């Protein structure tokens, strides 16, 4: 891996977790020509599909062009577009976590800013556990100080669904902890009506939505706080989204003339947004790892099921089946009486036993056999504890 | 409510209740000019502000042409689009089913066939109850002879999530019972590669995908059968999201013609997708009512709990917690000496009956303060139920 190419950041295995690179990534951060600066973190994600990648190439332009002159560049109308990998069509191509592995140094106060890029694998691609993407957006979430949720056409159930799961993925997360939050709104209906006000009055009739409602608060606290802006782009026209080189010439001109504003913002902000440590200290490169390290060890600590909505479904109400036919078990054990013999006893107990058994695979919801065995085994070895210490005890 | 105009089939109230219009929809079915014919019934569902409205209407100057004419057409290319109200923007339009108030009438081996329209409110609305529009687009979905799953770019997670949900609202809504669906890809990448044969490719290589997977064997026997298809539209254009009458000349070339094509063959293939009824003999309008209002009140009858994933993972968690300090209550009851005195047990049983409830309370997860209450409120019950049978017996 040599400078100037992306580089895999973290990577999801069969089990559900997520790895590091130790060495690649690590002596990124680590370079001494640059590991004392402050830094900038931007990370970009949110749904699959969605010109993520193709964005932060842009940004990279813009970078790249502040870099050399101070001056601000997408580059020239004919430059195919290059840097992270991007792709048209319905197949994923970003998996994991990506950075650039160099930072980009911009001018700051007579020092430097060590801006890096982080690059993420997009939500609702079903051939990816959505437990593992959401580990995977909520880290790129905890690590930055300039957070891109690229949102396509406008804000829905699926994005405040997801956006609120990143935000409960440990206290790191919440929103008070979210240096910056662009919700960057792709594909905007309007090609003639994107500005920055229409914006701010697009989030404020959301927030009239959510304060109806129970199910989004750390959005609502973020969409509320100072902390949180929204940008539009309208669509980028066919010439961007089939066969296309990404030049600038390809683009749609009210999505090129947004996309210019939109980077240029970007670019522009990145003094305002230094990151910080715990205390409000400014984060240098050097310290940017161990942070990824402890917070990629919490994400791999806890397990937690997200699924379908029909699986999650059938996952609460079998749940309260089998806690109703324990207590039932209990219940009858109780109800029995104390002058049974005990060799009688244990017959009617064990009968009863293998009757809800019966009533539990009766009464099961869902077509998962293999889950239905775990969840009978479980009941089993449960039922089989009440057993024994009853018929010890009796 | 005069003839050709909308009209509200279904709504829902305040208890997440199906109301069907007992008398305005349910006089349009038994009409004596056409309610001994057989029907033709086209629904579109999906998800939000991506016009299934706007295409309903197409699909009606398409209908009228071949009333009149027995010919195909979409109308003069200056005429502004009429019919079930739609509406550029974020904001939703359509709420509940409309119909339109009177069939079609088309030819049909010397007779008629009589279609009707259904015209539901999409998905993923965050001020409208996720429950009640699953119930009514699986209503939709168990009446239609011809649905059409409107999607937006590809299909993903959200629209397996929710297919999958629609064909388990009970046995009627299962795939083998779905007589023709029709998987329409709205702003599809490509504005030149949508044809039938990249739309048959498409489709197989998500039942690649989906055969790796446990969570949509609905979906995937659907996919599988030969009564599913799929049809790919490119993005319509600026001219059609934005401001906009509608009308065939504000239209990108593209979208025009996969437009006309899919028309078309909605059309065309109207007298091959007669609605049946459970018996498979052909339904006549007469007893299209009878169905609607049995199935509405199968919908009403069950209470599913749909809601966030975030929020659904804490009632999974707080219900398994809730069966642990039950099951702690019963091990401590059994635990108890019979040689204690009453009235030192009942105190030793009172206090533990404290000290478990304040152990929900440190352990419940989320923050929806009204549903801890319930929550408490529901094991202070069932506890109090253990203590008296023990304590009443002891
Ligand atoms: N619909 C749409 N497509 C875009 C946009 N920007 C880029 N694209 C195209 O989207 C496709 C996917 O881009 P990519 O960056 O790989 O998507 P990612 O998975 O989100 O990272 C490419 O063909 C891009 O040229 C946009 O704003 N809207
Ligand atoms: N992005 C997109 N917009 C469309 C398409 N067809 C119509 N529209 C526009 O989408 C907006 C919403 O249309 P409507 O029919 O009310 O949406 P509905 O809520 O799905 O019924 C209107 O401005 C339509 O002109 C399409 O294929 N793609
Ligand atoms: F679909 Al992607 F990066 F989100 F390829
Ligand atoms: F958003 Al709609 F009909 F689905 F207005
Ligand atoms: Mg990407
Ligand atoms: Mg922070
Ligand atoms: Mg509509
Ligand atoms: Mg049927």
Redesign the interface.
Known sequence: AEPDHPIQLVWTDVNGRLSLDLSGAHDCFLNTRYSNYPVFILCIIG???RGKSFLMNYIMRALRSMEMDEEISLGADDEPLKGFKWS???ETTTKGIWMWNRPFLLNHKGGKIAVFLLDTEG?????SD?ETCIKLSALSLFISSHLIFNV???????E???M??YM?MGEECGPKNLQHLDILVR?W?????WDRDVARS?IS?EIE??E??????KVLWSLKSNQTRCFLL??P??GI???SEGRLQDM?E?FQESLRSYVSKVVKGICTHIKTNIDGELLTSAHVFSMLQEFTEVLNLQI??????????Y??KN??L??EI??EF?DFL?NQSSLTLPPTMRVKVSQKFSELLEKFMQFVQG??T?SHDAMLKDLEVRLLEIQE??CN?F
């Open positions: 749904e699959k599909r048209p069509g319905t939500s609702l691609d079903i051939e959505r396509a056409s406008n804000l829905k159930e699926t405040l669904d997801y609120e799961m409960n594909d209906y309007h090609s003639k009506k697009y009739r939505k959510l109806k409602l129970n199910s989004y608060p309208p669509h026209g066919k989204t089939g066969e749609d009210d937690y099921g997200f699924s379908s909505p029909m699986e999650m479904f996952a609460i749940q309260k089998m806690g324990e207590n209990q109780k077509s998962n293999s210490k009853f005890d």
